[PDB]
Amino acid sequence: PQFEKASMSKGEELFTGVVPILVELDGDVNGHKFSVRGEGEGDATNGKLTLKFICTTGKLPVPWPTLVTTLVQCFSRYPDHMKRHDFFKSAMPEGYVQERTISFKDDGTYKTRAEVKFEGDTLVNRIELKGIDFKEDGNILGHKLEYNFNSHNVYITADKQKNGIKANFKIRHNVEDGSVQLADHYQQNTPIGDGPVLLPDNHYLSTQSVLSKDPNEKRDHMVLLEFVTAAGITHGMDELYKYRIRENLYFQGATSAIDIPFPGTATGVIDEGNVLSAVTQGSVGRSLQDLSEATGINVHVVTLHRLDYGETPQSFVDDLFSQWFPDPESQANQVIIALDTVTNGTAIHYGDAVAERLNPETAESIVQETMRVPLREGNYNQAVLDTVDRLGKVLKGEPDPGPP
Amino acid sequence: PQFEKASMSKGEELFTGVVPILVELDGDVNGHKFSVRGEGEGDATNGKLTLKFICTTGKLPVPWPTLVTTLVQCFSRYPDHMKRHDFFKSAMPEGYVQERTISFKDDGTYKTRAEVKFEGDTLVNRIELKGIDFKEDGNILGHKLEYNFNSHNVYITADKQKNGIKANFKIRHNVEDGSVQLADHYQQNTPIGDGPVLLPDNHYLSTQSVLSKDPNEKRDHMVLLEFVTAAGITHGMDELYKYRIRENLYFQGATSAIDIPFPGTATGVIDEGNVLSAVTQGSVGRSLQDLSEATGINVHVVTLHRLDYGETPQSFVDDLFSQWFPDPESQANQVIIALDTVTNGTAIHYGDAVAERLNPETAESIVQETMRVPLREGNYNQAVLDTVDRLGKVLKGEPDPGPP
């Protein structure tokens, strides 16, 4: 079996071999202050990672395993069929901001902000950690955690408004008395630069960590080794799918036009890519209804997650319109605007009655300029409202306003 | 997110913690004879594995990395949503026979047979290896391979006839001159005992190996550490799906009745679970056609991979018959027999005209005894032919023969 061997981003090629790694952390938990420095290497092709951390201020005031997740997901092994979903490498060399909240069950919580970026040939992770309201003799400050680490799944989803991702997972820390201490993780990454990045389908990383000690070393330290790979889960893999309906977990795949059936409505908005607020849809709804009752032109606005490979925005919107409005009579009385929320590609289609009021060069200007300019900052709500505002005045037969 | 935490086989519960491990290998390559013994532990919940191998006969005549794949896939981490596909643990404690052929590109080939089974509380892998026609100064016998190891995917499929699995993968061995030496792997596993086992959907294991040396050790040896997890890939995850049609790679999922459209044929066989030879289908074809032309009863035989969760063999065959033959007139002139090839569950449905010749207690005997008895040994061809033979004589109006 052979898959897409080609490079999917420029950043991906920086990790082609072994990349040196540096980690720096300034922490404060309940006021006990500390610092950690770490160095090692990473081999992203194989998903291998090797680091040695040391506490530069004495002995760690918290247990080492509690800092593992804080102390470079760009070194994950994305198999060939998953390469299009590797956000982390696509943000390089500029890097990303990785922020987290870590709630230890029945105990305090960490608050973390790091920058992960290339400085020369080395990948650098620079962290600030703050820990609040921990129990004086709890599992954390009391150092009751075992020096070992379990494997986990990190569930990832795209944050399209921020041109980044979000992730959630539960870390299980073995307690020396046989119990288990839970650390719920909420995470957000956002690229430092303005270059383009890969916005992923829902997927997960399966993680493994092996903690050890350096016999020669006498400072307080941790030796860590890791393997990491990405994978996806679709609804058909989940025996429990039928029952957990009463999201952000399943690999969406591409949207083909047939996947969107005609809504059965004169006008409206179809937010399949889930980028629009209910308040926005309510406003767009009233506007398109205004246009209909006055001009008798019916518009639908369709968002979607991403398009099939090989199919373009124009080709999707052309197919959809044929499917919705088979009869040429059902045509012309109808419009459709489409938006790919992963790529921000847009396109329109309309029947001749509309073109009896809408010129090509204008119609392009409305989807390629008025609509796309706000997507430059991830403002999908404004992109749709502006487009609705400009087009509606055209179809009401008014002075066309300008593009941005 | 929460998935099926429950146990899917009895064998699965033997790996609940850390299991001690023992490996024994007797090898002969081009006549250079050797033995290796290894001991360590495995933690299948986390997909971790730790072993130390030593050559008991001097220095290894071949490079250590070339024996990694030969020297316990039961220690793989199956995530919760994949537990139904873990063949390896379900064959325990009796175990399985793991046989392989390893073709080193432009060089010789290994031939291997092992038994993996529990002896007391320890998992034991006992291997015989034979190597044939290697190059005297090749990459193998010449010891030109680097002491390191890449990550790989092991692609797995069910071998239903043998109540086991098959797997294929390509191992890439780094060569000290910068080139890469390929070792194509063909594999077959079969349970040692007669107890029930899990037959899996297509899936893969993503593997990682870290090779190291023991400083205190002076014998020829290898220290190995491993992480391993299972995952699946459906067609929608593969950008190249549309082009590689002109198999055994994609996670099949369950078959619902709607997935099988009415074939458009008076009679025939539909081998959706892909267990029947063309020669068998040709024979069944002529028989069912004989029954039709003579008695005017039309039979279809349908196999399928496995059923949706919650749906039974009877419930699938009842739905299918309604879907194929809506009109009660299209009924009675028609029969349908269904077979789940993963579970060997069977069921029939027929219209009243058939029951004007076919008694319930008999119809059951034909699908629950005549058809299932040959499935006990994985003989799907004989199961269908026997059932066709017995039923056809009933519907021709002849002395019913017996069940097994």
- Which domains are present in chain A? 11-237 (2.40.155.10), 257-395 (3.10.310.50)
* Least Cα separation, residue B253 to chain A (angstroms): 6
All residues at 6 or more sequence positions from B74 whose CB lies less than 8 Å from its CB, including other chains: B15, B44, B88, B89, B91, B92, B116, B123
Tell me, what DSSP letter sits at residue A39?
A: E
Q: How far is CA B40 from CA A149, B23, B72, B122, in A?
A: 19, 9, 12, 10
Phi, psi of B85 (to 5 degrees): -115, 10
Chain B residue numbers with beta carbons less than 8 Å from the beta carbon of A233 are: 81, 232
All residues at 6 or more sequence positions from A326 whose CB lies less than 8 Å from its CB, including other chains: none
- Of the candidates A151, A234, A238, the beta carbon closest to that of B46 is on A151
A147 inside 8 A of chain B by CB: no
Q: In whole angstroms, what separates CA A273 from the centre of its chain?
A: 13
Query: How many other CB atoms sit within 10 Å of the CB of residue B193?
Result: 14
What CA–CA distance (Å, rounded) separates A231 from A251?
Answer: 9
Tokens describing residue B309: 């969760």
Closest CA to A366 of A343, A342, A349, A341: A349
Task: Check A309 against B46: CB less than 8 A apart.
Answer: no
- Of the candidates A227, A253, A309, the beta carbon closest to that of B208 is on A227
B18 inside 8 A of chain A by CB: no
Q: In whole angstroms, what separates CA B253 from the centre of its chain?
A: 14
β-sheet bridge partners, residue A335: A299, A350
Task: Check B151 against A46: CB less than 8 A apart.
Answer: yes
Q: How far is CA B142 from CA A30, B32, B172, B265, in A?
A: 61, 13, 17, 62
Residue type, A44: A
What CA–CA distance (Å, rounded) separates B318 from B337?
Answer: 10
- Which H helix or E strand runs over A302? strand A298-304
A208 inside 8 A of chain B by CB: yes
- CB-neighbour burial class of residue B90 (10 A; exposed 0-12, middle 13-18, buried 19+): buried
Mutate to test the interface with B, among A166, A233, A245, A305 (most CBs of B within 10 A): A233
Closest CA to A83 of A159, A9, A19, A154: A9
Phi, psi of A277 (to 5 degrees): -70, 155
What CA–CA distance (Å, rounded) separates B76 from B60?
Answer: 28
For B336-345, b/e burial (b = at least 16 CB within 10 A) is bbbbbbbebb
B residues 319-378 near A, CB within 8 Å? none
Residue type, B282: G
> This structure's resolution (angstroms)?
2.1
- Of the candidates A151, A155, A251, the beta carbon closest to that of B77 is on A151
Chain B residue numbers with beta carbons less than 8 Å from the beta carbon of A254 are: 236
- Method of determination used here: X-ray
Q: Is A9 left (phi over 0), alpha (psi -120 to 50) or beta?
A: beta
Tokens describing residue B117: 């089974």
Chain B residue numbers with beta carbons less than 8 Å from the beta carbon of A48 are: 151, 208, 210
Chain B residue numbers with beta carbons less than 8 Å from the beta carbon of A47 are: 151, 208
All residues at 6 or more sequence positions from B102 whose CB lies less than 8 Å from its CB, including other chains: B69, B70, B109, B110, B111, B112, B171, B183, B184, B185, B186
Closest CA to B171 of B144, B191, B148, B141: B148
Chain B residue numbers with beta carbons less than 8 Å from the beta carbon of A309 are: 239, 242
By C-alpha distance, the chain B residue nearest A238 is B81
Task: Check B237 against A253: CB less than 8 A apart.
Answer: yes
Mutate to test the interface with B, among A43, A68, A151 (most CBs of B within 10 A): A151
Tokens describing residue A169: 């997972």
Classify A288 as helix, strand or coil: helix
By C-alpha distance, the chain A residue nearest B200 is A237
Tokens describing residue B386: 């026997």
Task: Check A151 against B229: CB less than 8 A apart.
Answer: yes
Instruction: Compute and round to an integer the Cα radius of gyration of chain A.
Output: 25
Task: Check A227 against B3: CB less than 8 A apart.
Answer: no
* Least Cα separation, residue A148 to chain B (angstroms): 11
Phi, psi of B132 (to 5 degrees): -130, 135
What CA–CA distance (Å, rounded) separates B70 from B137?
Answer: 23
Chain A residue numbers with beta carbons less than 8 Å from the beta carbon of B214 are: none
Closest CA to B129 of B152, B143, B109, B150: B109
Query: How many other CB atoms sit within 10 Å of the CB of residue B296?
Result: 11
What CA–CA distance (Å, rounded) separates A60 from A32?
Answer: 9
For A250-272, b/e burial (b = at least 16 CB within 10 A) is bbbbbbebeebeeeeeebbbbbb
Closest CA to B234 of B275, B271, B202: B202
Task: Check B79 against A153: CB less than 8 A apart.
Answer: yes
* Least Cα separation, residue A69 to chain B (angstroms): 17
Helix axes A380-395, A278-295, angle to 10 degrees: 10
Task: Check B155 against A1: CB less than 8 A apart.
Answer: yes
The residue to which tokens 């892998």 are assigned: B125
Phi, psi of A368 (to 5 degrees): -90, -15
Tell me, what DSSP letter sits at residue B27?
A: E
Chain B residue numbers with beta carbons less than 8 Å from the beta carbon of A236 are: 234, 251, 253-254
Q: In whole angstroms, what separates CA A331 from the centre of its chain?
A: 38
What CA–CA distance (Å, rounded) separates A283 from A277?
Answer: 10
By C-alpha distance, the chain B residue nearest A76 is B151
Closest CA to B362 of B324, B328, B395: B395
